[PDB]
């Protein structure tokens, strides 16, 4: 059981597994509660990607920094920014300094960059959580593989805008990948380009889908490169995020995404009291005994 598992067709195809129930439960909402956008279009109309395989391309890192700057200027209370690899976060935050960007991100919010010490990460997390509560703005940028996004969960006002930089592919690792893929071709029947896309999307949607605790929590969750729009990679995000991924939001610019973020936060900072939920996204004692509600709950859940 997990909050993200997608697609469910592949866990019987890996684990030698035959279940009774293969179930996906749709996010039924009385309020939009999240918006995913795929910011895959630079402000210069440069195609945002990570095709270079961690060997830096300058203008794409420029547009990443521009995204982080303007999303800092819009979003409240803590932005979480997942990179691809620690070499790539190393190189990106390197070239956000020689290039004149990172002082402006300082002017809007307080950075807490990650390191692979076990104690320095915990101190950076503690100051990041003491800066989302003592007035100022805090922004935690990490790697989408490590322990930062495995257990350490970001709740109502600690991450409002989970910025997934890049598509996380395991690129550093050796012939263990080639050999596990040759195995999944041969003795299971799962393709090369199927398993790579599955692994990348389970890591990306794993690190994204921590921002939301309940119905009364709202998380902007942006995906920043063009590859998340290409049908197979978007097709393997879970159903409760594809349901709220609009075709207009598909392949936004930086500034169109910033304006969607502003309209999102303004429409979703108003009093959304408990009395707006008893119809749709909540149930009382006596709202259960009605068989019309039973028909509704029959219509919500689906299987695969």
């Amino acid at each position: 059981t997990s909050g993200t598992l997608s697609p469910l067709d592949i866990y019987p195809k890996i684990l030698d597994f035959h279940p009774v129930t293969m179930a996906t439960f749709t996010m039924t909402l009385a309020r939009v509660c999240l918006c995913p956008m795929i910011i895959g279009r630079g402000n210069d109309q440069v195609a945002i990607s990570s095709k270079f395989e961690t060997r830096e391309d300058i203008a794409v890192i420029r547009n990443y920094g521009n995204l982080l700057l303007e999303m800092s200027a819009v979003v409240p209370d803590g932005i979480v920014a997942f990179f691809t690899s620690y070499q790539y976060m190393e190189s990106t935050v390197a070239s956000w300094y020689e290039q004149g960007i990172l002082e402006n991100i300082q002017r809007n919010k307080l950075l807490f960059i990650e390191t692979q010490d076990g104690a320095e990460t915990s101190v950076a997390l503690e100051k990041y959580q003491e800066a989302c509560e003592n007035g100022r703005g805090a922004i935690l940028l990490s790697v989408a593989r490590g322990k930062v996004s495995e257990g350490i969960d970001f709740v109502h006002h600690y991450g409002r805008a989970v910025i997934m930089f890049g598509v996380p592919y395991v690129y550093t690792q050796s012939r263990i990948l080639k050999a596990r893929l040759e195995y999944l071709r041969d003795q299971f029947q799962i393709r090369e380009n199927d398993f790579l896309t599955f692994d990348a999307m389970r890591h990306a949607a794993q690190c994204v889908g921590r921002a939301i605790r309940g119905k009364t929590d709202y998380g902007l969750m942006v995906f920043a490169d063009k590859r998340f729009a290409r049908g197979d990679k978007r097709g393997k995000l879970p159903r409760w995020i594809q349901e709220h991924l609009t075709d207009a939001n598909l392949n936004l610019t930086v500034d169109e995404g910033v304006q969607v973020a502003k309209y999102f936060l303004r429409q979703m900072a108003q009093p959304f009291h408990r009395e707006d939920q008893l119809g749709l996204s909540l149930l009382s004692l006596e709202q259960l005994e009605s068989e019309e509600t039973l028909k509704r709950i029959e219509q919500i859940a689906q299987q695969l």
Binding site: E103, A119, E126, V148, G214, T216
Partner: protein, 408 residues
């Protein structure tokens, strides 16, 4: 310390009208200077009730230039560095003449760890960078995460952590492969972590309890529990008729016996049957002539009003006299009616009331002297309103004295 003197002075200077008052009271031999400056506390808390905390870009707000090695004179920048990096504070304690100047010292301040975010053996900020590294290692080793109670404990967020032996991803931290630019980029990461930690700690001045606290916070949902609405104390008025006929006094309202109701209904039902004379009945011309006689300016309803006979004879310097007088007597009655109202039944407040009585009597003497020196010029301009105010002070003093002697 001669603080107060410098305050009362600075004020007197900036506030010449207050200076005037200070003379008209102290110099006039009515009260003593100490009392006046004593009970006149009205000023600001601090320069701004605090300072401006180092927001961010304390090195890059007006970076290295009060117009690299340009001028360095911005107050926000030097005060924010004085708060933010106490190693630079101790270096400013050391090397400030004693053989360098702020040109050379701040030229040696825009060096590494501070403006370029490097990490190397360098000039006079090298031991300061070593002490900053010792402060980071004290935050990591002598200190740890305080709210590691139920989250954010990144060292032990794994129940079974082993060495690099029996694992899959054992090539995580490599003891080899230490480059120059890579170590520089790690240095930039460490300097920004330390910079933001010093900002957050500078803006923040100096067990199962915390663990169950963080657990019960991170578990709960705002939806599935209790609501968020405080209260509203219900104001159900008892006697709202007191609101209906309000503070207007009771007019003489004596409608007579209800026989008159029936009589008047009869007479006015008979009256409004036969109706409409328009030429004849409306005005006799003699009544109109007497009405024009009345509304002419020598008759009734022209009250001989809107006259307002004034005494504008010697305006300007008498107005200046009255400005001095009303400022002075305003300060006097300010102190009097400010300490006066509640009796404050102890001996210190009664002693302040006795000092107020002495200031009151000498104030009356100074007011009589000012009236004699002023009104003996051209024989006009009654100043007796100030004497009404001071006579009411005199009266409240004697009435309080008789009241408290009855309360003996």
């Amino acid at each position: 310390a001669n603080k107060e003197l410098e305050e009362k002075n600075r004020m007197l200077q900036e506030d010449p009208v207050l200076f005037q008052l200070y003379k008209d009271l102290v110099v006039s031999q009515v009260i003593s200077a100490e009392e006046f400056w004593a009970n006149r506390l009205x000023x600001x808390x601090x320069x701004x009730x605090x300072x401006x905390x180092x927001x961010x870009x304390x090195x890059x707000x007006x970076x290295x230039x009060x117009x690299x090695x340009x001028x360095x004179x911005x107050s926000d920048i030097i005060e924010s560095i004085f708060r933010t990096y106490p190693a630079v504070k101790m270096k400013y304690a050391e090397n400030v003449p004693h053989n360098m100047t702020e040109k050379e010292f701040w030229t040696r301040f825009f060096q590494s760890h501070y403006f370029h975010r490097x990490x190397x053996x360098x000039x006079x900020x090298x031991x300061x960078x070593x002490x900053x590294x010792x402060x980071x290692x004290x935050x990591x080793x002598x200190x740890x995460x305080x709210x590691x109670x139920x989250x954010x404990x990144x060292x032990x967020x794994x129940x079974x952590x082993x060495x690099x032996x029996x694992x899959x991803x054992x090539x995580x931290x490599x003891x080899x492969x230490x480059x120059x630019x890579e170590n520089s980029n790690a240095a930039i990461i460490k300097r920004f972590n330390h910079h933001s930690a010093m900002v957050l700690a500078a803006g923040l001045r100096k067990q199962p309890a915390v663990k169950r606290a963080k657990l019960q916070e991170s578990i709960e949902y705002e939806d599935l529990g209790x609501x968020x609405x405080x209260x509203x104390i219900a104001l159900n008025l008892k006697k709202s008729d007191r609101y209906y006929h309000g503070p207007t006094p009771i007019x003489x309202x004596x409608x007579x016996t209800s026989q008159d109701i029936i009589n008047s209904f009869q007479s006015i039902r008979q009256e409004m049957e036969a109706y409409t004379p328009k030429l004849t009945q409306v005005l006799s011309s003699s009544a109109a002539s007497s009405t024009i006689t009345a509304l002419s300016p020598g008759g009734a309803l022209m009250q001989x009003x809107x006259x307002x006979x004034x005494x504008x004879x010697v305006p300007n310097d008498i107005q200046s006299e009255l400005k001095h007088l009303y400022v002075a007597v305003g300060e006097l009655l300010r102190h009097f009616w400010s300490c006066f109202x509640x009796x404050x039944x102890x001996x210190x407040x009664x002693x302040x009331x006795x000092x107020x009585x002495x200031x009151x009597x000498x104030x009356x003497x100074x007011x009589x002297x000012x009236x004699x020196x002023x009104x003996x010029x051209x024989x006009x301009x009654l100043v007796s309103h100030i004497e009404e105010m001071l006579q009411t002070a005199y009266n409240k003093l004697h009435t309080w004295x008789x009241x408290x002697x009855x309360x003996x």
